[PDB]
Enzyme design. Sequence first.
Site, PDB file in Angstrom:
ATOM      1  N   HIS A 106       2.935  11.036   7.138  1.00 26.86           N
ATOM      2  CA  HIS A 106       2.070  10.812   8.264  1.00 26.86           C
ATOM      3  C   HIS A 106       3.003  10.222   9.212  1.00 26.86           C
ATOM      4  O   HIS A 106       3.760   9.049   8.754  1.00 26.86           O
ATOM      5  CB  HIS A 106       0.962   9.694   7.725  1.00 26.86           C
ATOM      6  CG  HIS A 106      -0.136  10.427   7.295  1.00 26.86           C
ATOM      7  ND1 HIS A 106      -1.261   9.525   6.491  1.00 26.86           N
ATOM      8  CD2 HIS A 106      -0.445  11.703   6.972  1.00 26.86           C
ATOM      9  CE1 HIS A 106      -2.094  10.631   5.893  1.00 26.86           C
ATOM     10  NE2 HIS A 106      -1.603  11.945   6.234  1.00 26.86           N
ATOM     11  N   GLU A 140      -3.774  13.348   0.981  1.00 32.43           N
ATOM     12  CA  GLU A 140      -5.265  12.871   1.437  1.00 32.43           C
ATOM     13  C   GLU A 140      -5.942  14.169   1.814  1.00 32.43           C
ATOM     14  O   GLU A 140      -7.196  14.318   1.503  1.00 32.43           O
ATOM     15  CB  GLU A 140      -4.885  11.802   2.423  1.00 32.43           C
ATOM     16  CG  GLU A 140      -4.091  10.588   1.787  1.00 32.43           C
ATOM     17  CD  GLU A 140      -4.350   9.373   2.643  1.00 32.43           C
ATOM     18  OE1 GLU A 140      -4.182   9.267   4.010  1.00 32.43           O
ATOM     19  OE2 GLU A 140      -4.949   8.311   2.229  1.00 32.43           O
ATOM     20  N   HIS A 165       1.677   9.057   1.168  1.00 29.34           N
ATOM     21  CA  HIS A 165       0.658   8.887   0.224  1.00 29.34           C
ATOM     22  C   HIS A 165       0.953   9.911  -0.912  1.00 29.34           C
ATOM     23  O   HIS A 165       1.530  11.142  -0.607  1.00 29.34           O
ATOM     24  CB  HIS A 165      -0.550   9.405   0.801  1.00 29.34           C
ATOM     25  CG  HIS A 165      -1.299   8.411   2.048  1.00 29.34           C
ATOM     26  ND1 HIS A 165      -1.755   7.280   1.919  1.00 29.34           N
ATOM     27  CD2 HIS A 165      -0.862   8.446   3.345  1.00 29.34           C
ATOM     28  CE1 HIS A 165      -1.942   6.838   3.036  1.00 29.34           C
ATOM     29  NE2 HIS A 165      -1.431   7.686   4.022  1.00 29.34           N
ATOM     30  N   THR A 204      -6.865   6.540   7.611  1.00 24.64           N
ATOM     31  CA  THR A 204      -7.220   6.770   6.297  1.00 24.64           C
ATOM     32  C   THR A 204      -7.075   5.528   5.465  1.00 24.64           C
ATOM     33  O   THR A 204      -7.279   5.652   4.153  1.00 24.64           O
ATOM     34  CB  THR A 204      -6.329   7.901   5.279  1.00 24.64           C
ATOM     35  OG1 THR A 204      -5.125   7.494   5.549  1.00 24.64           O
ATOM     36  CG2 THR A 204      -6.565   9.493   6.341  1.00 24.64           C
ATOM     37  N   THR A 205      -6.637   4.325   5.900  1.00 21.38           N
ATOM     38  CA  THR A 205      -6.441   3.098   5.467  1.00 21.38           C
ATOM     39  C   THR A 205      -7.345   2.149   6.084  1.00 21.38           C
ATOM     40  O   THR A 205      -7.732   2.367   7.142  1.00 21.38           O
ATOM     41  CB  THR A 205      -4.976   2.587   5.440  1.00 21.38           C
ATOM     42  OG1 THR A 205      -4.704   2.320   6.609  1.00 21.38           O
ATOM     43  CG2 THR A 205      -4.333   3.290   4.713  1.00 21.38           C
ATOM     44  N   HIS A 229       0.858  -1.241  -0.054  1.00 26.38           N
ATOM     45  CA  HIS A 229      -0.113   0.241  -0.084  1.00 26.38           C
ATOM     46  C   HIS A 229       0.873   1.163   0.202  1.00 26.38           C
ATOM     47  O   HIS A 229       0.555   2.203  -0.685  1.00 26.38           O
ATOM     48  CB  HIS A 229      -0.908  -0.096   1.324  1.00 26.38           C
ATOM     49  CG  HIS A 229      -1.649  -1.197   1.372  1.00 26.38           C
ATOM     50  ND1 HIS A 229      -2.736  -1.795   0.484  1.00 26.38           N
ATOM     51  CD2 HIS A 229      -1.426  -2.157   2.490  1.00 26.38           C
ATOM     52  CE1 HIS A 229      -3.262  -2.761   1.091  1.00 26.38           C
ATOM     53  NE2 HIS A 229      -2.491  -3.012   2.064  1.00 26.38           N
ATOM     54  N   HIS A 250       4.947   6.946   6.953  1.00 24.28           N
ATOM     55  CA  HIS A 250       4.674   6.726   5.604  1.00 24.28           C
ATOM     56  C   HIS A 250       4.366   7.750   4.834  1.00 24.28           C
ATOM     57  O   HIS A 250       3.881   8.974   5.395  1.00 24.28           O
ATOM     58  CB  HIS A 250       3.868   5.443   5.606  1.00 24.28           C
ATOM     59  CG  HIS A 250       2.429   5.895   6.166  1.00 24.28           C
ATOM     60  ND1 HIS A 250       1.819   5.869   7.261  1.00 24.28           N
ATOM     61  CD2 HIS A 250       1.398   6.453   5.366  1.00 24.28           C
ATOM     62  CE1 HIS A 250       0.755   6.434   7.523  1.00 24.28           C
ATOM     63  NE2 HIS A 250       0.293   6.843   6.453  1.00 24.28           N
TER      64      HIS A 250
HETATM   65  N1  LIG Z   1      -2.758   6.587   6.781  1.00 29.05           N
HETATM   66  S1  LIG Z   1      -2.822   6.753   8.431  1.00 29.05           S
HETATM   67  O1  LIG Z   1      -4.135   7.114   9.095  1.00 29.05           O
HETATM   68  O2  LIG Z   1      -1.616   7.826   9.252  1.00 29.05           O
HETATM   69  C1  LIG Z   1      -2.075   5.194   9.193  1.00 29.05           C
HETATM   70  C2  LIG Z   1      -1.749   4.374   8.392  1.00 29.05           C
HETATM   71  C3  LIG Z   1      -1.309   3.027   8.851  1.00 29.05           C
HETATM   72  C4  LIG Z   1      -0.870   2.201   7.959  1.00 29.05           C
HETATM   73  O3  LIG Z   1       0.207   1.264   8.411  1.00 29.05           O
HETATM   74  C5  LIG Z   1      -1.613   1.504   6.796  1.00 29.05           C
HETATM   75  S2  LIG Z   1      -1.363  -0.136   6.225  1.00 29.05           S
HETATM   76  C6  LIG Z   1      -2.014  -0.710   7.900  1.00 29.05           C
HETATM   77  N2  LIG Z   1      -2.821  -0.133   8.791  1.00 29.05           N
HETATM   78  C7  LIG Z   1      -2.899  -0.853   9.846  1.00 29.05           C
HETATM   79  C8  LIG Z   1      -4.079  -0.624  11.117  1.00 29.05           C
HETATM   80  C9  LIG Z   1      -3.791  -1.326  11.959  1.00 29.05           C
HETATM   81  C10 LIG Z   1      -3.063  -2.563  11.931  1.00 29.05           C
HETATM   82  C11 LIG Z   1      -2.350  -3.052  10.960  1.00 29.05           C
HETATM   83  C12 LIG Z   1      -2.195  -1.892   9.769  1.00 29.05           C
HETATM   84  N3  LIG Z   1      -1.717  -1.867   8.414  1.00 29.05           N
HETATM   85  O4  LIG Z   1      -3.235  -3.481  13.075  1.00 29.05           O
HETATM   86  C13 LIG Z   1      -4.535  -3.641  13.701  1.00 29.05           C
HETATM   87  C14 LIG Z   1      -5.332  -2.393  13.579  1.00 29.05           C
HETATM   88  O5  LIG Z   1      -4.701  -1.368  13.008  1.00 29.05           O
HETATM   89  C15 LIG Z   1      -1.327   2.826  10.240  1.00 29.05           C
HETATM   90  C16 LIG Z   1      -1.614   3.954  11.250  1.00 29.05           C
HETATM   91  C17 LIG Z   1      -2.235   4.941  10.751  1.00 29.05           C
HETATM   92 CL1  LIG Z   1      -2.729   6.383  11.841  1.00 29.05          CL
HETATM   93 ZN   LIG Z   2      -1.289   7.750   6.004  1.00 33.05          ZN
END
Ligand SMILES: NS(=O)(=O)c1cc(C(=O)CSc2nc3cc4c(cc3[nH]2)OCCO4)ccc1Cl
Ligand SMILES: [Zn+2]
Length: 257
Positions: free
Chosen positions: A116, A103, A93, A195-196, A61, A91
């Site tokens: 992020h 995003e 996007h 957001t994923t 991803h 990471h």
């Molecule tokens: N795009 S974002 O909202 O910053 C954000 C993105 C991620 C990612 O690593 C995207 S792929 C991914 N997201 C996950 C979220 C999870 C996880 C495993 C995950 N693998 O373990 C159990 C539930 O939480 C993880 C945390 C946050 Cl906050």
């Molecule tokens: Zn993110």
Amino acid sequence: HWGYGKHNGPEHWHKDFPIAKGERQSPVDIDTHTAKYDPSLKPLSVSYDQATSLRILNNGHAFNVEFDDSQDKAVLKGGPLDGTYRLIQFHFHWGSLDGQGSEHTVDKKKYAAELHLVHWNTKYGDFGKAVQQPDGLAVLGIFLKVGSAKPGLQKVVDVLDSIKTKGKSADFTNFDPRGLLPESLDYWTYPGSLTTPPLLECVTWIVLKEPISVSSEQVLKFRKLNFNGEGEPEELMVDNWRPAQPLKNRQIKASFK
Ligand SMILES: NS(=O)(=O)c1cc(C(=O)CSc2nc3cc4c(cc3[nH]2)OCCO4)ccc1Cl
Ligand SMILES: [Zn+2]
């Protein structure tokens, strides 16, 4: 099975993850003139002096740079937050072209990319337990525009050819995330979600007003990565962003006038 395509992309997610249509989803458009200036918000405190990176991973991803979060070494606090949040990973996007990739948007403006920096609330003891709580995570979001190179990003760009495809990883030690931060810590903040998938509504979003600049060559290297695994048809890792979601019953606050 979720991804970023025609068949499995954002518009599909709600079938596996019904919270996709919930009351506090991210990202959102930040309407800079409807955001409320809050003189009571504290300066953000970003303490990255003792950050320890471990590894970098293509998960099909994005690429995650992961940190040892087993002690209080790289912490976020202050701002809108109560207590202490520990850095686990960062990471990005990004887009197929410079004109999209972020995003969050600012008065509908899309940036080339968005960073992020993911932190979890130390009252919940680890990331897995934190995501199950409404104040489990704090994500510092930083926009990237294309212009001058960000020297502090080159070490990330250089290792990407070693993790081209889904599932590859490489150790990635002594990376300093202070080299990815703009000058100002002026921010907007609102309650939202991952957001994923699984799109859990556990995030306090802290979005910096000031973008960093990255060179066209640096972002071009992000675009050479692959969503597929080694030995499957090549699908370039581009446009791995979720579009703006409804604000619903939420106020975005600003730390600045
Ligand atoms: N795009 S974002 O909202 O910053 C954000 C993105 C991620 C990612 O690593 C995207 S792929 C991914 N997201 C996950 C979220 C999870 C996880 C495993 C995950 N693998 O373990 C159990 C539930 O939480 C993880 C945390 C946050 Cl906050
Ligand atoms: Zn993110």
